[PDB]
Amino acid sequence: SKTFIIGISGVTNSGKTTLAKNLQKHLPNCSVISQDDFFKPESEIETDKNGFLQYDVLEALNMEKMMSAISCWMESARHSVVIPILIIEGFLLFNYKPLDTIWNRSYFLTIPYEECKRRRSTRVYQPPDSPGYFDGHVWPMYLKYRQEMQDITWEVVYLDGTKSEEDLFLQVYEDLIQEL
Ligand SMILES: Nc1ncnc2c1ncn2[C@@H]1O[C@H](COP(=O)(O)OP(=O)(O)O)[C@@H](O)[C@H]1O
Ligand SMILES: [Mg+2]
């Protein structure tokens, strides 16, 4: 019956998947769900005035399919001990109200504008980032999300994504040992 559910959010390229993976390998009976696995097909993505595909919005995501994956994990978690841990990591978690009571802990990776743009440029997407995509869409949708975070009623731990991978792992691991 009992579970421990962790949210890891933050801007694109802030190290969410990396952190989730480092935690998983050190925590027993731990799983990870990635929001990145639940994008709608390209044809269902809206395009704005400037021709920018709206990927960085809840409407780009099949959150019904994501919820069923979380329910599948819970059912598995029930038979996993003869406390199971789930880590949900993704760029748009904490503004999704159906999940607002799920979080036992809530982490938010932050990196500044320049570093985010730098990392984002080293990654190859499907389809590739158009020129101007970061300034015309990615960063604006991020600031909109941070504005939406201002009415979150529960505690969120903001993490500095420019710290080394191990530094971030230890910081979160130390926090978790104290919460579990
Ligand atoms: N602590 C860190 N410091 C610097 N770079 C990192 C760190 N963690 C991950 N990265 C790198 O930044 C990029 C984004 O990492 P990833 O974990 O995929 O981010 P996200 O899941 O938030 O998109 C990758 O190239 C990855 O190797
Ligand atoms: Mg990721």
Residue numbers in the entry: 1 to 82, 92 to 189
Could you share sentences copied from the article?
In one pathway, specific NR kinases, including human Nrk1 and Nrk2, phosphorylate NR to nicotinamide mononucleotide. NR kinases are ∼200–amino acid polypeptides related to human uridine/cytidine kinase 2 and Escherichia coli pantothenate kinase. Nrk1 consists of a five-stranded β sheet flanked on one side by α helices, E and A, and on the other side by helix B. Additionally, the monomeric enzyme contains a lid domain consisting of helix C and D connected by a 12– amino acid loop. Thus, human Nrk1 and human Nrk2 are dual-specificity, NR and NaR kinases.
To dissect the structural basis for specificity, we crystallized selenomethionyl human Nrk1 bound to Mg2+·ADP and solved the 1.95 Å structure of the Nrk1 monomer by single-wavelength anomalous scattering. To understand the basis for substrate specificity of human Nrk1, we prepared a selenomethionyl form of human Nrk1 and grew single crystals of a complex of the enzyme with Mg2+·ADP. A crystal, which had the symmetry of C2221, was subjected to 0.9793-Å synchrotron X-radiation, and produced nearly complete diffraction data to 1.9-Å resolution. Single-wavelength anomalous scattering allowed location of Se sites and phasing to produce an interpretable experimental electron density map of the Nrk1 monomer prior to model building. The 1.95-Å refined protein model includes residues 1–82 and 92–189 of the 199–amino acid polypeptide, plus ADP, Mg2+, and 72 water molecules with B factors between 9 and 37 Å2. The guanidino group of Arg132, the ɛ amino group of Lys16, and the hydroxyl of Thr18 coordinate the β and α phosphates of ADP, whereas the hydroxyl of Thr17, a β phosphate oxygen, and four well-ordered water molecules coordinate the magnesium ion. The adenine ring of ADP lies between Arg128 and Glu174. Accounting for the ATP/GTP nonspecificity of Nrk1, the 2 carbon of adenine is solvent exposed such that the 2 amino group of guanine would not appear to preclude binding in the same manner. In the absence of NR or NMN and in the presence of the ADP product, Asp36 stabilizes a Mg2+-associated water molecule.
